[PDB]
Amino acid sequence: IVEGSDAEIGMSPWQVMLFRKSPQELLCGASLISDRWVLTAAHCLLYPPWDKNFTENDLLVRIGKHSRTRYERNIEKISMLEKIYIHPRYNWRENLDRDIALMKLKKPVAFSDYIHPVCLPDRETAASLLQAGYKGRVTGWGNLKETWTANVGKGQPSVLQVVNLPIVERPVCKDSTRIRITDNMFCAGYKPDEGKRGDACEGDSGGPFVMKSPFNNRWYQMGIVSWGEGCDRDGKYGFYTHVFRLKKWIQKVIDQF
């Protein structure tokens, strides 16, 4: 997260860390959507151009975390994965269309002050809240700046970062890039005329873009950090998987399994 701030304790209790067992490393963010299911970006698990194709046994999910690097004994919970489900129409070759995956945990996790699921949007919540100018919130432990040989100093955060960003009109998103965008994506970030900063960045993928509904006081996951070009660049916007557009698939998987 670029030009964000440290999260408060318990601020995003649905935030999950996807953690590689060997070598040890942060792979991606993810989100907790029930006691046994975690949502993430497909490309965190399968992306052939970078020789990435992980199986269930390569990964752990760490839930309830604040520090990026500490083992937060008696605060975090570490869970193993039973099965990974990638959207069958995920397009890694061209534009990361339908960049979504579900993971089923081997055992249910117990909720706590630090561990609690986010809601998925219904049609009315999506129509009410997914409008240009309205702000949502993105969280992650990804890079603090776009990777560049000229950078000086710390590139990774000590604790979970948070930034709030406005949704951008579709035509503005479309004109900002030469990558083909689809109805399964939306973009967010400040426009040049607003003169403000803030973005997701590498290492934040899979994490949630959330909005709070004033109609029922609940937080909803509207997006998944997917892709961008650089981080925090002038005239660019970050791109997010449109969770409501793909909700039928999510519901099919959860109900089936």
């Binding site: 701030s5 006691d35 609690h116 998925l120 949502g136 919130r137 709030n164 937080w219």
Partner: peptide
């Protein structure tokens, strides 16, 4: 679940986080 989206340390105790209102103001 039935309880989704309500945080133990915030909504459940009627407390606001530091930048929450910025979201509400935009809606």
């Amino acid at each position: 679940e039935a309880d989704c989206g309500l945080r133990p340390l915030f909504e459940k105790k009627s407390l606001e986080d530091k930048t929450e209102r910025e979201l509400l103001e935009s809606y």
